[PDB]
Ligand binder design. Structure first.
Ligand SMILES: COc1cc(/C=C/C(=O)O)ccc1O
Ligand SMILES: COc1cc(/C=C/C(=O)O)ccc1O
Lengths: 249, 250
């Protein structure tokens, strides 16, 4: 448990080492989704699985989320991207760190897709877990996570997601992002994981992205939901097999 | 007045100057300086005073790592600047006297207003990029920023900038992502581009191309002039004047 500073916004994070406390291991940065945080069941499961195969984990609470600074309503993808650059720059100064990996769920899955492209030289492999990768396009077309609006007259505030508020700025920012450019720029190995009864983010976009990527493996979680209600073990298993593969090379 | 606008704990220094008049209700132009610049530079002040003279309030703002605002120069990126601009807009929209909101900006601030205006396209009435540095994302993509050559695929941790300044490589990683042409396409209200045709820092011809891409843009060339209009600043202000009186008359 610590704080990484990002322009005065404290980002809360958890560095978990393998039990053996090795002097050298790789690091995976893990990013939760919209209204999420680093202690969610699926985040912890992935983190624990990694730790048992020798990968340190750095789970970071993004702007306005978890125990980080900022209000939820003020968060945007530019801020999240800025935070991720700050967490990478922090990881780069850790002595124990050999290679750096990225994983993340939903909005956090999208965010690591963006952020690995931007850090393409640095990030050895990428794990988007049910990435909300259509957020930008659907924003341009007038919806955000179930809520609709005129994409040319964005409201000042959107109220939804169980008592939360969100400034229209979120939408103004998301609309600018061309996700496909980021996908074309990251040619290193990608595992996308996705449940095919996902209610929140549609399975079929992940199929479309797995194919755009130069080197992407798509693992389907049969019958499963957005946060893997039914089969989280199938996700942890997927991540385990992929990463054993990657740390061997 | 002078004031600080909070942007997530980063204080942004700004100047609100009224048309004096008052008046009771009037338009407001946001004015954004360029890379290593600030709100008290000659060319910025001059444009500011001209607007004030024809009835438009001005809100000049220092961006992250610049002028009197918080943060280090080497830590600024275009995403920080844009985020800063949306906080300035959010502040402006709360001012009771404000009728219409315009944007203007010089060089990197010219680029920033091209981007921000598209993002705020329902709010911003007209747009004035002054010698906009709108090639920055393209030359970041090619590894040719600041008289340097670097691999755009293996960006250095730190680049040397103007006059002993440093610039982190994050600046580049962020700039490579921005497709200026998308933002140009999305802003279909009146634009006035101004550019001097002996511009040392930012090639004139790029502004020709952008001016044709925009649905409604007038380009005013300043023949013989430099990046900061060392010779014919008069012409810039006169250009801004006539465009704006015309926009006020609509
Ligand atoms: C559909 O309602 C919701 C969707 C999400 C999605 C989060 C994400 O994609 O990261 C979060 C909270 C909600 O209440
Ligand atoms: C960051 O690299 C550059 C920045 C600028 C911006 C200049 C300005 O805003 O005055 C111009 C040329 C460059 O190569």
């Amino acid at each position: 448990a610590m704080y990484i500073d990002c322009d005065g916004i404290k980002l809360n994070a958890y560095l978990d080492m393998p039990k053996n406390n090795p002097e050298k291991c790789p690091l995976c940065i893990i990013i939760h989704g919209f209204t999420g945080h680093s202690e969610e069941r699926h985040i912890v499961a992935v983190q624990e699985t990694l730790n048992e195969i020798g990968v340190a984990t750095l789970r970071a609470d993004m702007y306005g989320h978890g125990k980080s600074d900022g209000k939820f309503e003020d968060h945007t993808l530019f801020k999240w991207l800025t935070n991720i650059l700050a967490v990478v720059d922090y990881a780069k100064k850790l002595d124990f760190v050999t290679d750096i990996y990225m994983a993340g769920h939903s909005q956090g899955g999208l965010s690591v897709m963006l952020a690995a492209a931007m850090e393409r030289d640095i990030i050895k492999a990428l794990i988007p877990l049910s990435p909300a990768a259509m957020i930008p396009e659907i924003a341009r077309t007038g919806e955000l996570l179930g809520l609709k609006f005129d994409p040319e007259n964005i409201p000042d505030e959107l109220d939804a997601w169980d008592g939360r508020k969100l400034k229209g700025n979120y939408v103004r920012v998301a609309q600018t992002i061309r996700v496909e450019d980021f996908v074309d720029k990251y040619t290193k190995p990608v595992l996308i994981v996705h449940g095919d009864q996902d209610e929140a983010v549609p399975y079929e976009a992940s199929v479309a992205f797995s194919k755009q990527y130069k080197n992407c493996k798509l693992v389907t979680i049969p019958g499963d939901t957005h946060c893997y209600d039914h089969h989280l073990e199938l996700v942890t298993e997927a991540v385990k097999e992929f990463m054993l593969e990657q740390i061997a090379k």
